[PDB]
């Protein structure tokens, strides 16, 4: 601006937000995780079990056969191709997403690995170790190992290098964001899975009815090398009213809880004083030592390393160890399976002992009421698994299976004397199917709901679905609640209203998920700067040292934590340590935790430093920076590039996660909180908090909301539940989900005729493209009690406005059909069947089909019309209802249009599937015009259906002649307290009168009084009231009507897709009761609650008729001797018989529901005899 | 997708003013409020018709025709 060092304002923060979204986008987490997995994780997985060795020993049978062979298969580098598809005839070509969607193909690339096949041989002289030598056979080629589905708009996809024009050529929408997969032609989004972080000690309290009072648990996890989890639990047995409370730890593969002292001695610390020194780090904390004395007393009889190890070993579940391999067995368990996340190599007992003491110390601190039990809902202890890690574990499992198959083939080839064919040893189908099956379904194996069909109802729906997270609900916590740690990380308003309330979360706009990096460089850096190793740490000679943790591993201690943290922070800010790395300094606890693992959710914040030039703390970002941010923003529409990364590398913004958020002070705004320190009565009361130690500042408070809540105008003037309702409902509004809807064949699609952009908009909406792809219209809304047809959440719509096109939409439905081949003999074809050669032809009309069995686009269709004609051949010697003559050789397998739907055929495409069979897609157009059953909503939870429609001359009018497009009841306002609805109408009224876009972002300086002054400047009543006239008589209404524009949305629920009645119709095969489903002419359920109500009414005969004549009614014949339905009745011959009873004259007929007959027969199958009798044997 | 022919509320013809509206915005450097009044749109029902319209047909025209003559 003027000075490149002047402080910025709250308006300049939106330039920073704009830069953030220019660099990242809205689906950054999906693309970033996949790119990391494909780039780095795939190579790592194959470099874990790359070597497979098959040793053929001497097999001493004769001295002419004394050589021992060793065959080795090793995997080298892995290569990935571009997406491709192989046809039935064996031709492979590049596949683009548009063709994959239309042809039901999977968008995937191929994986290749370099394989080295070595063979050594050695002379097996008896009773000697061998010297294997390479026998001059080292073959070294690329081997196909399967196909990897490719996420769209990723590094390996064809659309990452495409410009806007290129996307248009490829029939792709520029507004499309990617982040999903195409499996069998279906768009699938991977929902992030929420889990609890590993390698963190957590201390919990147990209820009264349990011998254990406290338990410190750590789910040890190693991110690289084996992926298996082993849990260690340290339990404090006994209650507070006991005379002896000891501590016992659970080790893997030991079957029993060992006293902690025994474990310490097994690690090499025999002196009791040293053990206590490892647990308690203060020599005068006698209260903690007093609680430790019982432990050292329990394990007194063991006083050396070997006896302790044998004590551990005999508890182990191996029973192959005899008595002498049993000490080593315990030693190996303590080395490779005890606390694996520190290390698994020989010679690190000191680290294990110190960490075990650390866990015990935390357990005792909580047991002594010095610490509170760890909060399970703390969002900083949670991890979100994205597509990257999810595909990583799936691939790890599948590659293990592939390698196992490879060796089994090697062994089988060596024994059964066959030739080795590398084409059969490696089955590429293993990788291809496992990834396809897991992505087609949600079943992550060989967890559910991990993959869902991406919503494409509207643009906002797609964006929200691509940023959802899930939490699988025995647990002791309240995970459904909105925790404090959720601030600025997940939207506080967007959650389902059903059983998923609080379990399905949505990321905030500026939220991000880390991909994780290598912790080794940081550990090496710490070692060079004075992080004294943990092998020489004497707690009693340094009772001020800070413990240094890296990914939950206690690596050492530091004498000057302050300088180390300063050096670490400066390195991260200038760009030597990855910004995703989280650094926390718990000054009181004397701990320094560094986190580098993947799955931590973080968000950016401004950095606040002293800058003594002004004498008070201020943001590092100045107006000079903001000037160049916007200069680069507008030069695109050439100064040096200056992006979000430049802010990050210059130390002006900082990524912060929930755990690091515990040690910082944040200012809501730089306007008032940063400056050292009449008022407008209309402005809200803002609390200063008068703190002079701020370390960071919010970019803007509005970014705490998600995609769905960022469309709400003035969400801070609404009751919170209304914001939640709108977040859910905004995903059901018709709009323009994509600009290429005329080249896509979706199952269903709704397109608004004339989408408008809201008069009252939000600044966050600038990045959601709601102005380019809006979902709704600006209707002139009056809040009045006009005719009583808007009572109880209904509305009156203007028929004249409907006639002109208000809220009118297109509806598209696609029908799919294939030419199946039932083996080698029976095959189908698309045909126009004739009534003389085809059986079971539908009662509809085939007049619109062509010779290929398809209706040409542009033809109008209606109910029962056949749009895809198909026939299949039949087997002879099967006659149904007569009507089956030698002329008939085909049967109808046609596809009719939906019974209730009609329209015009819009598009017909014919192509071939992966297997080369012909299949077609037919799309039908129809226009939906608002009627008296359609649902409409505003952006404030106010939804309703049209009660009635009126023409313009019947509606209430103003002196200017303006009539409402929509009338809602005043009674909808008070109880719901949706004040934002009324503020939006006032703002939109001013916006239309002045020709501007109203600013409705939540936390701003805009007040109702300011809008009122603007409205009065335009010659209108300041509060939005107008004098209206009755349309029937023309007289003034005694009251004045709140009247102005409001953004309404047409929802997905239309009555014409719900109305359905049934007199009689098809029945189910099993129970012979009305079928389920409106689409199948089904009936309605007269359930148990309805039965109870009719019992309360005393309508016995009506209850019987509903259950008998309106549903299954069946007549059976029962025997008078045995009450079984075993009577063979020849009703034509008037003969009855119950063989077994040898009677023909004691038969009765009863009327029971067919389900009752089914029930009794099922009981008969279970050897139960329900005998129905027509007379009583006992008195009441 | 394309400009509505009539105002929804009152039915005044507004589909013959889109190009005039755009030309006023571009070449005359007028603010949208002044342009709306210069076109004769006085009632705010008509102003929001032209002020909130999104021209999607321009996006649809970027795709090559399905069937060329």
């Amino acid at each position: 601006f003027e000075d490149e060092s002047a402080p910025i304002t709250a308006e300049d923060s939106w330039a920073v937000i704009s830069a953030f979204f220019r660099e990242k986008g809205l689906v950054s987490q999906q693309l970033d995780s996949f790119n990391q997995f494909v780039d780095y994780t795939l190579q790592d997985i194959i470099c874990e079990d790359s070597t497979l060795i098959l040793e053929q020993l001497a097999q001493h049978t004769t001295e002419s056969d004394n050589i021992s062979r060793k065959y080795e298969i090793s995997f080298g580098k892995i290569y990935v191709t571009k997406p491709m598809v192989n046809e039935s005839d064996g031709v492979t070509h590049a596949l683009y997403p548009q063709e994959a969607r239309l042809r039901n193909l999977t968008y995937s690339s191929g994986l290749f690995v370099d394989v080295k096949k070595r063979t050594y041989e050695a002379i097996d002289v008896p009773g000697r170790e061998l010297k294997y030598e390479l026998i001059a056979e080292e073959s070294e080629g690329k081997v196909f190992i399967g196909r990897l589905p490719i996420m769209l708009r990723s590094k390996n996809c064809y659309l990452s290098e495409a410009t806007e024009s290129d996307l248009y050529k490829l029939k792709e929408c520029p507004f499309d964001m990617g982040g999903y997969f195409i499996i069998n032609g279906s768009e699938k989004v991977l929902i992030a899975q929420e889990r609890s972080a590993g390698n963190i000690v957590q201390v919990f309290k147990k209820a009264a009815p349990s011998p254990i009072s406290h338990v410190a648990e750590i789910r040890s996890a190693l991110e690289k090398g084996s992926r298996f989890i082993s849990t260690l639990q340290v339990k404090l047995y006994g209650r507070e009213g006991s005379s002896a409370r000891t501590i016992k730890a659970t080790l893997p593969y030991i079957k029993q809880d060992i006293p902690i002292v025994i474990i310490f001695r097994a690690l090499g610390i025999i002196p009791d004083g040293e053990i206590l020194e490892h647990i308690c780090y203060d020599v005068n904390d006698w209260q903690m030592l007093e609680m430790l004395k019982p432990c050292v007393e329990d394990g007194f009889v063991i006083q050396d390393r070997e006896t302790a190890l044998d004590f551990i070993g005999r508890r182990g579940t191996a029973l192959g160890i005899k008595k002498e391999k049993r000490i080593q067995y315990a030693k190996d368990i303590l080395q490779k399976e005890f606390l694996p996340h520190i290390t698994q190599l020989e010679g690190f007992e000191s680290r294990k002992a110190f960490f075990l003491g650390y866990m015990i110390n935390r357990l005792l601190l909580c047991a002594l009421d010095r610490k509170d039990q760890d909060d399970r809902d703390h969002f900083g202890k949670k991890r979100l698994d994205l597509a990257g890690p999810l595909l990583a574990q799936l691939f790890k499992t599948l590659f293990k299976k592939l390698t196992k198959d490879i060796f089994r083939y090697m062994q089988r080839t060596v024994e059964e004397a066959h030739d080795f064919n590398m084409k059969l040893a490696i089955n590429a189908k293993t990788i291809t199917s496992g990834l396809k099956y897991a992505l087609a379904t949600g079943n992550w194996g060989e967890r559910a709901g991990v993959s869902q069909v991406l919503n494409r109802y509207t643009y906002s729906s797609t964006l929200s679905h691509l940023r959802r997270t899930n939490t699988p609900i025995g647990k002791l916590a309240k995970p459904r609640q909105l925790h404090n740690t959720h601030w600025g990380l997940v939207c506080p308003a967007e959650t389902p209203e059903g059983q998923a309330c609080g379990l399905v979360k949505n990321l905030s706009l500026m939220s991000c998920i880390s991909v994780g990096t290598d912790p080794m460089p940081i550990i090496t850096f710490l070692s060079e700067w004075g992080m004294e190793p943990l092998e020489d740490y004497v707690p009693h000679q340094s009772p001020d040292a800070t413990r240094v943790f890296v990914n939950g591993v206690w690596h050492g201690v530091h004498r000057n934590p302050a300088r180390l943290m300063e050096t670490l922070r400066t390195l991260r800010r200038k760009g030597d340590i990855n910004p995703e790395v989280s650094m926390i300094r718990d000054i009181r606890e004397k701990e320094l935790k560094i986190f580098t693992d993947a799955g931590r959710v973080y968000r950016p914040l401004f950095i606040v430093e002293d800058d003594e030039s002004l004498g008070h703390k201020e943001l590092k970002v100045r107006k000079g920076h903001i000037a160049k941010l916007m200069a680069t923003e507008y030069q695109d529409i050439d100064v040096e590039e200056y992006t979000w990364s430049s802010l990050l590398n210059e130390g002006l913004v900082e990524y912060i996660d929930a755990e690091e958020e515990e040690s910082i002070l944040i200012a809501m705004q730089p306007e008032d909180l940063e400056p050292a320190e009449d008022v407008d009565p209309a402005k809200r009361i803002r609390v200063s908090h008068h703190a002079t130690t701020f370390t960071h500042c919010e970019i803007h408070p509005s970014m705490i909301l998600g995609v769905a809540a960022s469309i709400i105008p003035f969400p801070d003037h609404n009751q919170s539940p209304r914001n939640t309702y709108q977040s859910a409902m905004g995903k059901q509004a018709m709009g323009v989900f994509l600009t290429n809807y005329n080249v896509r064949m979706d199952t269903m699609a709704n397109i608004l005729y004339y989408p408008q952009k809201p008069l009252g908009t939000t600044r966050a909406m600038e990045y959601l493209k709601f102005r380019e792809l809006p979902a709704g219209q600006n209707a002139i809304v009056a809040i009045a009690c006009y005719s009583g047809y808007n009572q109880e959440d209904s509305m009156i719509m203007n028929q004249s406005s409907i006639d002109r096109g208000l809220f009118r939409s297109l509806f598209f439905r696609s029908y799919m059909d294939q030419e199946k081949k039932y083996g080698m003999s029976i095959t189908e074809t698309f045909e126009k069947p004739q009534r003389t050669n085809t059986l079971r032809m539908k009662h509809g009309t085939y007049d619109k089909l062509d010779d290929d069995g398809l209706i040409a686009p542009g033809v109008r269709v209606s109910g029962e019309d056949v749009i895809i004609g198909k026939t299949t051949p039949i087997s002879p010697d099967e006659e149904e209802l007569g009507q089956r003559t030698a002329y008939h050789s085909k049967r109808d397998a046609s596809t009719p249009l939906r019974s209730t739907e009609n329209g015009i055929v819009d598009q017909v495409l014919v192509t071939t599937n992966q297997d080369g069979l012909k299949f077609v897609k037919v799309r039908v157009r129809t226009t939906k015009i608002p009627q008296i059953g359609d649902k409409f909503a505003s952006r404030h939870g106010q939804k309703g259906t049209i009660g009635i429609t009126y023409r313009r001359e019947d509606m209430p009018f103003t002196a200017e002649g303006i009539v409402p497009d929509l009338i809602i009841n005043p009674h909808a306002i008070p109880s719901r307290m949706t004040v934002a609805h009324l503020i939006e109408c006032l703002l939109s009224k001013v916006a239309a009168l002045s020709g501007n876009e109203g600013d409705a972002s939540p936390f701003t300086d805009i007040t109702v009084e300011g809008i009122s002054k603007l409205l009065r400047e335009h010659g209108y009543q300041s509060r939005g009231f107008e004098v209206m006239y009755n349309g029937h008589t023309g007289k003034k209404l005694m009251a004045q009507i709140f009247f102005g524009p409001t953004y309404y949305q047409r929802l997905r629920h239309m009555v014409d897709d719900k109305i359905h009645a049934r007199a009689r119709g098809p029945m189910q095969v099993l129970t012979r009761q009305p079928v389920e489903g409106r689409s199948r002419d089904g009936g309605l359920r007269f359930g148990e609650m309805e039965r109870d109500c009719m019992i309360a009414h005393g309508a016995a005969s009506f209850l019987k008729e509903r259950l008998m004549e309106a549903s299954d009614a069946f007549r059976v014949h029962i025997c008078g001797i045995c009450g079984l339905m075993t009577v063979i009745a020849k009703l034509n011959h008037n003969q009855f018989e119950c063989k077994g009873c040898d009677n023909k004259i004691d038969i009765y007929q009863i009327h029971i529901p067919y389900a009752a007959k089914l029930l009794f027969q099922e009981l008969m199958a279970m050897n139960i005899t329900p005998r129905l009798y027509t007379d009583r044997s006992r008195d009441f | 997708m394309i400009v509505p022919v009539r105002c929804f509320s009152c039915g005044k013809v507004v589909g013959d003013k889109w190009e005039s509206y755009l030309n006023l915005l571009q070449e005359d450097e007028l603010d949208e409020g002044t342009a709306l009044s210069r076109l004769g749109l006085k009632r705010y029902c008509c102003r929001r018709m032209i002020l909130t319209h999104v021209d999607l047909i321009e996006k649809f025209l970027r795709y090559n025709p399905l069937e060329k003559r």
């Binding site: 916007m630 402005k683 916006a991 876009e997 109203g998 600013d999 | 603010d31």
Partner: peptide, 19 residues
């Protein structure tokens, strides 16, 4: 007491002009 309008159409022109 504030400008309740998102001014985008010509504020880009103002900044582009200022430079």
């Amino acid at each position: 007491n504030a400008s309740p309008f998102i001014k985008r159409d010509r504020m880009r022109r103002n900044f582009l002009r200022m430079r």
